[PDB]
Design a protein around this ligand. Sequence first.
Ligand SMILES: *[C@@H]1O[C@H](CO)[C@@H](O)[C@H](O)[C@H]1NC(C)=O
Ligand SMILES: *[C@@H]1O[C@H](CO)[C@@H](O)[C@H](O)[C@H]1NC(C)=O
Ligand SMILES: *[C@@H]1O[C@H](CO)[C@@H](O)[C@H](O)[C@H]1NC(C)=O
Ligand SMILES: *[C@@H]1O[C@H](CO)[C@@H](O)[C@H](O)[C@H]1NC(C)=O
Ligand SMILES: *[C@@H]1O[C@H](CO)[C@@H](O)[C@H](O)[C@H]1NC(C)=O
Ligand SMILES: *[C@@H]1O[C@H](CO)[C@@H](O)[C@H](O)[C@H]1NC(C)=O
Ligand SMILES: *[C@@H]1O[C@H](CO)[C@@H](O)[C@H](O)[C@H]1NC(C)=O
Lengths: 596, 201
Amino acid sequence: STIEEQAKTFLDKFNHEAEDLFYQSSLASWNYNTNITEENVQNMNNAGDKWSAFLKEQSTLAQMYPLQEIQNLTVKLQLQALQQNGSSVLSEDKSKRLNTILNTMSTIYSTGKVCNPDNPQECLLLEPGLNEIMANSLDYNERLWAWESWRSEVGKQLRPLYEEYVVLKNEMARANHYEDYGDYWRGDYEVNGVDGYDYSRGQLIEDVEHTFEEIKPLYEHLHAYVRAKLMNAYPSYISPIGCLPAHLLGDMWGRFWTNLYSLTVPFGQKPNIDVTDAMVDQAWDAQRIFKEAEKFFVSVGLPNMTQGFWENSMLTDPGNVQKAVCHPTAWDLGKGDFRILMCTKVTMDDFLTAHHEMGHIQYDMAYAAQPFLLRNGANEGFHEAVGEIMSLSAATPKHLKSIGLLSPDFQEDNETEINFLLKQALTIVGTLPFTYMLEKWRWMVFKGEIPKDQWMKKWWEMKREIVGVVEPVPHDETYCDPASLFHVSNDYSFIRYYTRTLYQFQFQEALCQAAKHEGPLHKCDISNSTEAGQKLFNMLRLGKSEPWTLALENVVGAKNMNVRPLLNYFEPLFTWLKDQNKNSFVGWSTDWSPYA
Amino acid sequence: PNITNLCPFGEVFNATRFASVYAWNRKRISNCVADYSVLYNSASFSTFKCYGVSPTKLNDLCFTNVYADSFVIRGDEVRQIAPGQTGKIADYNYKLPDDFTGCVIAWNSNNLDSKVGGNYNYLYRLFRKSNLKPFERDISTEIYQAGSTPCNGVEGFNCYFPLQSYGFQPTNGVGYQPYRVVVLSFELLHAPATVCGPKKS
Ligand SMILES: *[C@@H]1O[C@H](CO)[C@@H](O)[C@H](O)[C@H]1NC(C)=O
Ligand SMILES: *[C@@H]1O[C@H](CO)[C@@H](O)[C@H](O)[C@H]1NC(C)=O
Ligand SMILES: *[C@@H]1O[C@H](CO)[C@@H](O)[C@H](O)[C@H]1NC(C)=O
Ligand SMILES: *[C@@H]1O[C@H](CO)[C@@H](O)[C@H](O)[C@H]1NC(C)=O
Ligand SMILES: *[C@@H]1O[C@H](CO)[C@@H](O)[C@H](O)[C@H]1NC(C)=O
Ligand SMILES: *[C@@H]1O[C@H](CO)[C@@H](O)[C@H](O)[C@H]1NC(C)=O
Ligand SMILES: *[C@@H]1O[C@H](CO)[C@@H](O)[C@H](O)[C@H]1NC(C)=O
């Protein structure tokens, strides 16, 4: 009869057909990931092509129902999600060129192998050949060689490809009534039609700058401390007044600073909270790791894992004969099928990762009651944030003592809390200026603020201004230094990590207030608290049905992303860093004072 | 006295194939001895919810006829086989009256009704213009008209085929796994009641 009822029946038909087709595609992707064989690649490609063709045909059918004649918010949300053209609005030649460019960037990044000139008989791939060198070496020129050689080969291959990529993506986005591709990425946080809870694409950049201006003193003090420690590690290269050299940050790109914890530890004499040896002594299998994670999630009141989870997941490396992707991934395959693909070792990192991925699984299970096209996070930040809060809670010494993994006579003094908070800052605080600078650079590239002949002059200028990291030697425009990273070379949004980091501590304060924890925020554990799990599950059950602002109101009581919980989390470390930086100089100079 | 000629519950519960919920099988059971304690004390049933009567006195009471309706639905759709419920199965496939006397028995059949490729032999009606009356069967395969345009018998735009297949894989969740449902309807009519329980010696 009416247009709204027509759209509702069409959405019912789409949900029923799409759920089975998505399950077939997801099962094929799982069979490729747990078994890397060429016929599984072909089966994955066939299922993915069927799924994409079905989405094209259903979007073509979906557009015939106009949006402004529908008043129900959930129906309008599903129709908005379905009616996006994607690349279909672009011409077939340019669509084929864009798909070819994306695939060849994926192959160049995945199969990029670089080794030293005059010694070419064997070479090292990025994972794990270059990762281990970047994370463990203490030699200046070796890390400089690895960094410059990988940005030489990868950037000089990817620079014309990225120049084609920006033009094609901007053409597709302006064909989709967006200002640029950056506006298309910022449209994930766009809320329209809800009274009071509306969020704009232009508000995202303003909110990110407003939060980063409050991030900046903590990052300046952390940067000064890391600069002083790296000056101790490398005596002559680092200047007291200048930026950090780029190849010394412990990772390939500077994404995380967590591999500098050995060099920058405050109190090495005091012990660590490493529980690896304790699990090895008690012979903890990966099955026991996931069962302890499940015990954590049933203690907070969330549902326990399905029988199909324990039957169908791969929680251990299969062997030499069977090939699998080593990256930990939680899979919502559809039709109530939830699996975790992780090559789990007996380490603290794998145990925390098990908590993180089972948090992903809990988030996926919670919105299973929602319609198919609303089965997502409210934004891209929440989905990762709900795993990172489990990683926060499980890492606490109270949780380790409670499950028996830590000795009950372990002394929790202020020094261990300082060095634990510094490790968490190197992981968490250090990624924030890099993430913000990378997304702001990509937004200015898509917006046309930066011309193609000035990409790198601006980029290093941004990195010196924001991240406080200087290039070792100057790079011309033949280099493509951003696209050496996984997310930018493979067409992924990057602001999800910034929003995830802020949502993580906002959710942590909300659940710790729910759990009535009376101490520091980093000492807080959300186990045994039914009300914290209920406050979590109220947002978890919504999925994408409600705006992310309303979901954030449901958890923390605020309509916008906030920076104060993060600053409250690191406040003991902030006071300690302000005490330790009396002699040294906080802040950096954008000049070439260390090295250029 | 000594009792023989039990009611054919083996041809209802242990059937090799079950009907689809849109075309649910109804078997009228008359003139035999119905032993209900065999069903109630079985550990193989997940749902044995009886409405209007208790299972303990079923083996005593006597009824004129017993209607055994058999079909297959999903795990999440078992709750809709109840008086007063709302959903696709209750509105469009199988409707129970509010004044219903009988029992709803459901059990998981992922072992039988799921194959690795996907078992698409079970259909359900997705669209109908109006809700079903209680104990009504709709086996029509005429194109549903959701829009003003005439369908003309072809599935185009706003015109959908009302029967949709169930996807049954063995790796699905318990809310998507196939459940075989047998609904027993007990009525007493003015004719002499012949479906009686077993009498103790
Ligand atoms: C992985 O693929 C090989 C090659 O077909 C196959 O023999 C093997 O059974 C697969 N592994 C599993 C666990 O199915
Ligand atoms: C929107 O539609 C859903 C079903 O599609 C319904 O449950 C919900 O109540 C509707 N909301 C409003 C405000 O009409
Ligand atoms: C998708 O592309 C078609 C063809 O240009 C256009 O008519 C339609 O408005 C587009 N949809 C959206 C949501 O922009
Ligand atoms: C999950 O919890 C339910 C209820 O507490 C329990 O019956 C079930 O056995 C649990 N699942 C597993 C795999 O133990
Ligand atoms: C820990 O507390 C003691 C006692 O107040 C103090 O002397 C010491 O400086 C503190 N350590 C740190 C790292 O703040
Ligand atoms: C949470 O509950 C379990 C079960 O009673 C208990 O063993 C554990 O010690 C509790 N955690 C804390 C921190 O008390
Ligand atoms: C049906 O099959 C089950 C499972 O083997 C069996 O226990 C039962 O006796 C059979 N017959 C009836 C009437 O339930």
